[PDB]
Amino acid sequence: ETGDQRFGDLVFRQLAPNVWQHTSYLDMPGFGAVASNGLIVRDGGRVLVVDTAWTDDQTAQILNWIKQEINLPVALAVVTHAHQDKMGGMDALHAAGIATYANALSNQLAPQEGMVAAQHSLTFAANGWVEPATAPNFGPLKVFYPGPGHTSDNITVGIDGTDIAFGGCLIKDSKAKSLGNLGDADTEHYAASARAFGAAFPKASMIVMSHSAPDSRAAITHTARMADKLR
Ligand SMILES: FC(F)(F)c1nnc(S)n1/N=C/c1cccc(Br)c1
Ligand SMILES: [Ca+2]
Ligand SMILES: [Ca+2]
Ligand SMILES: [Zn+2]
Ligand SMILES: [Zn+2]
């Protein structure tokens, strides 16, 4: 779509004055090329990243795009669970000197999932909000653990000062006919987790997700409606 920029294999789209979506693609062999989206946030004199790309090389291209187009240091990255689309590029972040954060559970599961763990672990209260001492200096990033759904470790992030919340792989677009890859899913708690994400970011009107283009809040309720049928 017009307005989008390509750098290498990555596509970028501005969502807000200080927010961009990054999109990377993995070619399952002779199968569907599969898109995955993350976010880039300009916070004053620094940049914050949400999710790697599928690969280290694709991840370096994110970082090089930021250097060329924004020209501010990346202070940290938060990754949203231990699958290849979200943590495939951790080695690239580390090679670049970025501090990395993930749900403690993501870091614990990372080895079995064939992912490199992030450096630092987020933990969460019973109400789902990140324990702030584990997410120091996150600026406008508000990190919320909605409960198990796409995976037991899936986390979400709202961007304060914008209309944007990022549901990662938990949320599907409002015309989706399935819930995608359920290989690590919790089918019993999924619906409640989708709804909890909506409740955490009641003011968000643009919902960004890993595997569809940004949607309205309709994505949340539609996802929950699908998930209701798993139980
Ligand atoms: F549209 C799809 F199919 F891409 C999708 N929608 N929701 C989910 S989750 N997916 N797939 C996610 C996925 C596919 C291959 C490998 C890994 Br690791 C994750
Ligand atoms: Ca690697
Ligand atoms: Ca798995
Ligand atoms: Zn996933
Ligand atoms: Zn995914």
Short mmCIF file of C-alpha atoms and ligand atoms in Angstrom, two decimals:
data_model
loop_
_atom_site.label_atom_id
_atom_site.label_comp_id
_atom_site.label_asym_id
_atom_site.label_seq_id
_atom_site.Cartn_x
_atom_site.Cartn_y
_atom_site.Cartn_z
CA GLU A 1 0.00 0.00 0.00
CA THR A 2 1.09 3.55 -0.83
CA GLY A 3 2.98 5.22 1.99
CA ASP A 4 4.70 1.98 3.02
CA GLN A 5 8.48 1.78 2.84
CA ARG A 6 10.65 -1.26 2.07
CA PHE A 7 14.17 -1.79 3.46
CA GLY A 8 15.62 -5.11 2.33
CA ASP A 9 12.92 -7.69 3.05
CA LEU A 10 11.13 -5.54 5.65
CA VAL A 11 8.13 -3.27 5.11
CA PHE A 12 7.37 -0.34 7.36
CA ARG A 13 4.20 1.65 7.87
CA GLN A 14 3.74 4.75 10.05
CA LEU A 15 0.76 4.32 12.41
CA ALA A 16 1.23 7.57 14.43
CA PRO A 17 3.75 10.49 14.59
CA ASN A 18 5.96 8.37 16.81
CA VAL A 19 4.85 4.81 15.96
CA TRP A 20 5.66 2.52 13.02
CA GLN A 21 4.70 -1.04 12.22
CA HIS A 22 7.42 -3.41 11.03
CA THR A 23 6.51 -6.42 8.89
CA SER A 24 8.74 -9.38 8.04
CA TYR A 25 7.99 -12.56 6.10
CA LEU A 26 8.99 -16.19 6.48
CA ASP A 27 8.74 -18.57 3.54
CA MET A 28 7.50 -21.88 4.84
CA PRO A 29 8.92 -24.23 2.08
CA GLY A 30 6.91 -23.68 -1.15
CA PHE A 31 4.08 -22.68 1.25
CA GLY A 32 2.52 -19.34 2.18
CA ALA A 33 5.02 -16.56 2.82
CA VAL A 34 3.89 -15.59 6.32
CA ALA A 35 3.83 -11.99 7.52
CA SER A 36 4.61 -10.98 11.09
CA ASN A 37 4.23 -7.46 12.50
CA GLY A 38 5.95 -5.68 15.40
CA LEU A 39 6.22 -2.04 16.49
CA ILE A 40 8.81 0.75 16.63
CA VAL A 41 8.22 3.63 19.06
CA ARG A 42 10.04 6.99 19.16
CA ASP A 43 10.18 8.10 22.83
CA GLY A 44 11.88 11.53 22.96
CA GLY A 45 15.53 10.87 22.09
CA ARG A 46 15.35 7.09 21.95
CA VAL A 47 13.58 4.27 20.16
CA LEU A 48 11.77 1.26 21.67
CA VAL A 49 11.08 -1.93 19.70
CA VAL A 50 8.31 -4.49 20.16
CA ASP A 51 9.12 -7.93 18.69
CA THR A 52 11.93 -9.06 16.45
CA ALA A 53 11.45 -10.15 12.88
CA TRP A 54 11.49 -13.86 11.99
CA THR A 55 15.25 -13.87 11.52
CA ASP A 56 18.46 -12.22 12.70
CA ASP A 57 19.08 -10.81 9.21
CA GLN A 58 15.55 -9.43 9.04
CA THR A 59 16.02 -8.03 12.54
CA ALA A 60 19.23 -6.21 11.55
CA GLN A 61 17.28 -4.65 8.69
CA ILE A 62 14.76 -3.24 11.18
CA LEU A 63 17.65 -1.77 13.13
CA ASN A 64 19.29 -0.33 10.00
CA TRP A 65 15.98 1.18 8.87
CA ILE A 66 15.65 2.87 12.30
CA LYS A 67 19.23 4.25 12.05
CA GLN A 68 18.56 5.63 8.52
CA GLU A 69 15.05 7.02 8.98
CA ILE A 70 14.87 7.93 12.68
CA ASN A 71 18.57 8.16 13.60
CA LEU A 72 18.04 7.69 17.35
CA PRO A 73 19.47 4.91 19.57
CA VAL A 74 17.31 1.90 20.34
CA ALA A 75 17.13 1.77 24.15
CA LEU A 76 15.31 -1.54 24.53
CA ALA A 77 13.15 -4.20 22.91
CA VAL A 78 10.28 -6.17 24.42
CA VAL A 79 9.37 -9.47 22.78
CA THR A 80 5.90 -10.93 23.20
CA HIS A 81 6.39 -14.67 23.42
CA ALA A 82 8.87 -17.44 22.50
CA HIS A 83 7.97 -18.15 18.86
CA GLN A 84 10.22 -17.45 15.86
CA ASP A 85 8.18 -14.51 14.57
CA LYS A 86 8.61 -12.63 17.88
CA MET A 87 12.02 -13.77 19.17
CA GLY A 88 13.72 -15.20 16.05
CA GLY A 89 16.03 -12.18 15.86
CA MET A 90 17.26 -11.94 19.50
CA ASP A 91 20.87 -12.54 18.44
CA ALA A 92 20.62 -9.51 16.15
CA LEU A 93 19.27 -7.29 18.94
CA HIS A 94 22.07 -8.46 21.21
CA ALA A 95 24.73 -8.00 18.54
CA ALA A 96 23.44 -4.46 18.27
CA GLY A 97 23.72 -3.79 22.03
CA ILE A 98 19.98 -3.38 22.72
CA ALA A 99 18.67 -4.36 26.17
CA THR A 100 16.06 -7.07 25.78
CA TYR A 101 12.99 -7.92 27.92
CA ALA A 102 10.47 -10.78 27.78
CA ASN A 103 7.99 -12.47 30.07
CA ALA A 104 10.02 -14.62 32.50
CA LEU A 105 8.03 -17.61 31.17
CA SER A 106 9.15 -16.72 27.61
CA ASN A 107 12.79 -16.80 28.73
CA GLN A 108 12.23 -20.06 30.58
CA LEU A 109 10.59 -21.74 27.55
CA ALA A 110 12.94 -20.15 25.01
CA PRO A 111 15.37 -23.13 24.84
CA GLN A 112 12.64 -25.70 24.18
CA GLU A 113 11.14 -23.36 21.58
CA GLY A 114 14.56 -23.00 19.92
CA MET A 115 14.72 -19.27 20.79
CA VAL A 116 17.49 -17.20 22.44
CA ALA A 117 16.22 -15.81 25.76
CA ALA A 118 16.00 -12.09 26.37
CA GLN A 119 18.43 -10.64 28.94
CA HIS A 120 15.77 -9.46 31.38
CA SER A 121 12.55 -11.02 32.60
CA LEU A 122 9.20 -9.23 33.06
CA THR A 123 6.93 -10.49 35.83
CA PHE A 124 3.26 -9.71 36.32
CA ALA A 125 0.72 -9.17 39.09
CA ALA A 126 -2.42 -11.31 39.32
CA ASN A 127 -4.31 -8.48 37.61
CA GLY A 128 -2.01 -8.86 34.58
CA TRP A 129 -0.02 -5.58 34.84
CA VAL A 130 3.78 -5.77 34.69
CA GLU A 131 5.57 -5.43 38.02
CA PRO A 132 7.18 -2.00 37.33
CA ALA A 133 10.61 -2.83 38.81
CA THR A 134 11.00 -5.47 36.10
CA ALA A 135 10.18 -2.94 33.32
CA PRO A 136 12.38 0.09 34.25
CA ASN A 137 12.36 3.10 31.99
CA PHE A 138 9.76 1.71 29.52
CA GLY A 139 8.49 5.26 28.89
CA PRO A 140 5.07 5.02 27.12
CA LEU A 141 5.14 1.18 26.83
CA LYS A 142 2.57 -0.35 29.20
CA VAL A 143 3.00 -4.08 29.30
CA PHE A 144 0.08 -6.36 30.17
CA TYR A 145 -0.10 -10.14 30.57
CA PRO A 146 -3.70 -11.02 29.62
CA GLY A 147 -3.50 -14.71 30.52
CA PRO A 148 -2.75 -17.84 28.42
CA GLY A 149 -4.21 -17.93 24.90
CA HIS A 150 -2.11 -18.07 21.73
CA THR A 151 0.56 -19.24 24.17
CA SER A 152 0.81 -19.43 27.94
CA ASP A 153 3.49 -16.65 27.89
CA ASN A 154 1.89 -14.14 25.44
CA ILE A 155 2.15 -10.53 26.51
CA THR A 156 0.59 -7.35 25.08
CA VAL A 157 1.69 -3.68 25.07
CA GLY A 158 -0.16 -0.38 24.97
CA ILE A 159 1.47 2.84 23.82
CA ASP A 160 0.65 5.67 26.15
CA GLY A 161 -0.03 8.96 24.39
CA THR A 162 -1.50 7.13 21.37
CA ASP A 163 -4.61 5.23 20.40
CA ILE A 164 -2.54 2.06 19.90
CA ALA A 165 -2.44 -1.29 21.64
CA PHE A 166 -0.53 -4.31 20.38
CA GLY A 167 -2.23 -7.68 20.86
CA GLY A 168 0.63 -9.65 19.25
CA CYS A 169 -0.41 -13.14 18.18
CA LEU A 170 -3.28 -13.36 20.73
CA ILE A 171 -5.56 -11.09 18.63
CA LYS A 172 -6.72 -11.82 15.10
CA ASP A 173 -8.44 -9.39 12.75
CA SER A 174 -12.22 -9.04 12.84
CA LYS A 175 -12.78 -11.06 9.62
CA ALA A 176 -10.48 -13.97 10.57
CA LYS A 177 -12.00 -17.44 10.17
CA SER A 178 -9.63 -19.14 12.62
CA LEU A 179 -7.18 -18.55 15.45
CA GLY A 180 -4.04 -19.43 13.43
CA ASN A 181 -1.30 -21.56 15.00
CA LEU A 182 -2.63 -23.22 18.20
CA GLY A 183 0.36 -25.53 18.67
CA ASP A 184 1.18 -23.93 22.05
CA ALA A 185 -2.32 -22.51 22.74
CA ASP A 186 -4.46 -22.67 25.84
CA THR A 187 -7.87 -23.30 24.31
CA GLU A 188 -9.67 -23.14 27.68
CA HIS A 189 -8.50 -19.71 28.78
CA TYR A 190 -8.03 -18.04 25.39
CA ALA A 191 -11.38 -16.21 25.26
CA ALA A 192 -10.94 -14.70 28.70
CA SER A 193 -7.40 -13.59 27.83
CA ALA A 194 -8.56 -11.86 24.63
CA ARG A 195 -11.20 -9.98 26.60
CA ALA A 196 -8.71 -9.08 29.36
CA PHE A 197 -6.48 -7.44 26.72
CA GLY A 198 -9.46 -5.26 25.65
CA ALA A 199 -10.14 -4.38 29.30
CA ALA A 200 -6.49 -3.45 29.94
CA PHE A 201 -6.43 -0.91 27.13
CA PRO A 202 -9.99 0.41 27.14
CA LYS A 203 -9.05 3.60 25.29
CA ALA A 204 -7.14 1.95 22.39
CA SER A 205 -8.94 2.30 19.05
CA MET A 206 -6.19 0.92 16.81
CA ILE A 207 -5.38 -2.72 17.56
CA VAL A 208 -2.10 -3.90 16.03
CA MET A 209 -1.46 -7.61 15.79
CA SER A 210 1.20 -9.97 14.54
CA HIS A 211 -0.55 -11.58 11.56
CA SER A 212 -3.10 -9.06 10.23
CA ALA A 213 -3.08 -5.34 9.36
CA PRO A 214 -4.22 -2.93 12.15
CA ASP A 215 -7.89 -3.22 13.00
CA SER A 216 -10.40 -1.53 15.28
CA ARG A 217 -11.46 -2.93 18.68
CA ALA A 218 -13.70 -5.23 16.61
CA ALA A 219 -10.65 -7.53 16.35
CA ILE A 220 -10.74 -8.09 20.16
CA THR A 221 -14.38 -9.12 20.44
CA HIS A 222 -14.25 -11.16 17.23
CA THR A 223 -11.20 -13.06 18.47
CA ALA A 224 -12.92 -13.69 21.82
CA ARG A 225 -16.06 -14.90 19.97
CA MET A 226 -13.98 -17.41 18.01
CA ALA A 227 -12.12 -18.52 21.13
CA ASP A 228 -15.43 -18.99 23.00
CA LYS A 229 -16.09 -21.88 20.60
CA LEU A 230 -12.91 -23.76 21.59
CA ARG A 231 -14.16 -24.47 25.10
F1 LIG B 1 -2.21 -15.99 9.41
C1 LIG B 1 -1.36 -16.78 10.05
F2 LIG B 1 -1.55 -18.01 9.60
F3 LIG B 1 -0.15 -16.42 9.69
C2 LIG B 1 -1.54 -16.71 11.52
N1 LIG B 1 -2.50 -16.05 12.11
N2 LIG B 1 -2.33 -16.21 13.48
C3 LIG B 1 -1.26 -16.95 13.64
S1 LIG B 1 -0.57 -17.41 15.16
N3 LIG B 1 -0.68 -17.29 12.43
N4 LIG B 1 0.47 -18.05 12.18
C4 LIG B 1 1.50 -17.94 12.92
C5 LIG B 1 2.70 -18.76 12.70
C6 LIG B 1 2.89 -19.40 11.48
C7 LIG B 1 4.04 -20.16 11.27
C8 LIG B 1 4.99 -20.28 12.26
C9 LIG B 1 4.80 -19.64 13.47
BR1 LIG B 1 6.13 -19.80 14.84
C10 LIG B 1 3.67 -18.87 13.69
CA CA B 2 19.81 -16.64 16.16
CA CA B 3 6.11 -25.11 20.84
ZN ZN B 4 3.26 -17.34 18.31
ZN ZN B 5 2.76 -15.22 15.65
#
